[PDB]
Amino acid sequence: ISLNPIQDAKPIDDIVDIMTYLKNGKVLRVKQDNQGDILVRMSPGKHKFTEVSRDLDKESFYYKRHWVLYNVSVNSLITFDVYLDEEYSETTKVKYPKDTIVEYTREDQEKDVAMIKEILTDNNGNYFYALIGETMLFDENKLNKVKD
Amino acid sequence: PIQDAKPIDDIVDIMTYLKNGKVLRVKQDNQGDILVRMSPGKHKFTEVSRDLDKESFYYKRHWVLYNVSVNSLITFDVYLDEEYSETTKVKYPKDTIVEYTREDQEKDVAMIKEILTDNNGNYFYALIGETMLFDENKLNKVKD
Amino acid sequence: ISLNPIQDAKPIDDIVDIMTYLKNGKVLRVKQDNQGDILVRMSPGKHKFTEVSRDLDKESFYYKRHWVLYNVSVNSLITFDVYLDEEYSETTKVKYPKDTIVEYTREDQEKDVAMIKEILTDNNGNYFYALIGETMLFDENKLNKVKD
Amino acid sequence: EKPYMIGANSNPNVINKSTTYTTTTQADEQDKPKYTTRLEFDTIDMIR
Amino acid sequence: EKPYMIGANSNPNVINKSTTYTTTTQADEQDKPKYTTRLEFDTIDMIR
Amino acid sequence: KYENHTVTLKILMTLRYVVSDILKESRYQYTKFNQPKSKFENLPQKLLLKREDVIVLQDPYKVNDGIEEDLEIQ
Amino acid sequence: AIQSQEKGTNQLDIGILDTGTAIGTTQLEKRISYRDRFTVPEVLMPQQMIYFVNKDRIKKGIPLYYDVKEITYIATQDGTVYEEDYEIKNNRLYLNEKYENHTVTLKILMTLRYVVSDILKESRYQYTKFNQPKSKFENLPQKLLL
Amino acid sequence: FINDRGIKVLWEEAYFCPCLNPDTGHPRVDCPRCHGKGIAYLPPKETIM
Ligand SMILES: [Zn+2]
């Protein structure tokens, strides 16, 4: 009695694939450390150029995304982690995402460290975590993330 | 024929060559030619150099950072630097506007797209929107 | 089913003809790069001098053009393209005028360059263009103007 | 005869509009005027 | 179907929040705009 | 024709400035309203500039973009 | 609180030198002393410098005039430099043998620091009595010239 | 407000050229980086001021 696993948005690491998606015209979504989170698109039609928008939502019939020309920089793509719009969404803003290493309390009153490998949520929205070296699933309140 | 120019069509290839690290050469309109490069080491970022001539014992290329825009790459002509030939010695280069008389002795304007030559240096031109060849004398440069 | 050809306003290139029209009293229309578009007239009657007005419209019964003295300069006439009022009008503000060189898409998916030689409009206002080396007429949306 | 209706738009989009710079030229021009009220002192009152 | 009710709170407490410092970087960015009214002189009136 | 002559000119040149001193350098604000947390922002500096007349360098070589200006789209 | 932060620079025979001036406003009940010292970690200040390398400095490590928080740009005759060739420890710079005889130039960011040169409008007072068991004396903010 | 009142301008940072003579502490008369001035400059950046 739970919802199927929910996937995390994969940041695209290699420039070549990102350009390839961009050439096809698939929308990108870039997070700028300083200013904002933006979408990037290569213009439709034959008049080719790069376009940027800040209308961060699915293109609803009542929500028309608006585009403006901008000279996007290569270094901006490289340094800033970028996503594909079809994945990055409010559908999952999990506190500890997949591949995150956490400290979890074991039955023997020992705090061991393990990585999250699978994520799913019950109908009430509580996220169940699968951990390496463990069979059952774990709850968010039980866990602890050690940073640095 | 002469193969002095080998323009790249797809930017994806350009990025692939950049990942390989080979230097590029990007043309500019009424402005100096430029070379582009991907930086080595841990941090990958685009670099540029205003030095065109070949690396030598008396000549070293100077590289600096820049926030290059894809718009220049996708639009402007691009070449592999080492494969580029400095010039093709013809009266009217490619994409040069000329006035020519059509087959029925009626005059029309056209731009040039061809490179053909015999072994003596005699050149012929084929016009955009045309099939047959036109000589250096037949064509007339169209003034701006 | 279309309107007859519409003529473009010919700029007058030679000073001698311009003065000759002015001496006869025919009105001129000058465009100044910096300030404005103006009409020029030599005064009626025996009291001869040059006059300038900014009442840019046909002399309707309810639109009286007003004149004021001005010391028009020879160099102003030479440098600035000048027209005769009887031609320059809103009747045609065609995007690509006659003798303009444009790039047009051909049936073979090749973009050739050609000059506009004749202009006419259908009843709906769409301008039909005749091109050198081509028989049929061409539409504005199909065309492209290459500048410089 | 037929009713007047607004119809659809006609203005096409434009991108990267460049600003206009006034061109230098030695030629003459005419400065377009504005005809309106004018302010002045009352020099007669100043004498008083 | 069921009535909409507010429910309980969900925000957990946070202690010793550190301020955010803008990071220096040579990379490009986009400055987020504000579209609104603009003020200008009346240069035509100034000529008068 | 002008082998031995004196030539005189009037010319227009582009404006250029260099920074001689920094006045009212750093101004600050702990912006917190309508933010997830406190943030630090640097307010405008004021600069005291001087014109370049004794030494002059040409205008910088800017990388051009292929986008045509005043472009119409449909 | 700080006002009128100024970087006054003097170009001299000895070289270039920075004589900045600023005005500070403090809290209550704090007594400041001549030639006290303040430092603002949050604020960063840019500087530029150039050093010449020799067979000895390469081993010892370059002694930096300024302090360091982070580096921005490095260059020499051979062009820029990368993280794989240079390192900094305890505010001194080490380089590999490739730059034995070269001139290295840098742009750097450093944290802001001030010292007290004079005290202006030193002591301000008030006999606060309202809503108190008895009269109390309190020291109002001083103003500092840094 | 700054963008509204300002004028478009190119901005280039400054850094001492490597060409400085190590012994006299003064620069070469003519090199590509700096044309006699003792200070070099970086690639231009666009800004409103
Ligand atoms: Zn130098």
Summed up, what is this model?
Chain G: This is Capsid protein. Chain A has 148 residues and is mainly β.
Write a structural description.
This is part of a larger assembly, with 3 copies of chain A and 5 copies of chain D. Chain A is mostly beta strands and about 150 residues long. Chain A has helices at about 15-25, 75-80, and strands at about 30, 35-40, 50-55, 70, 80-85, 100-105, 110-120, 125-130, 135-140, 145. In chain A, the strands form 2 sheets. In chain A, strands 4-3-2-1-5 form a 5-stranded antiparallel β-sheet. A 5-stranded antiparallel β-sheet of chain A has the order 9-8-7-6-10, with no helix packed on it. Chain D is low in regular secondary structure. Chain D is flat and about 70 Å long. Chain D starts with 12 loop residues before the first strand and ends with a helix. Strand 1 (about 20) of chain E pairs parallel with strand 3 (about 40-45) of chain F, so a sheet runs across the interface. The complex binds zinc ion. The PDB classes it as virus. Keywords: phage, neck, connector, tail. Neck-tail junction of phage 812 virion (C6). Chains A, B, C: Non-cytoplasmic protein. The organism of A, B, C is Staphylococcus phage 812.
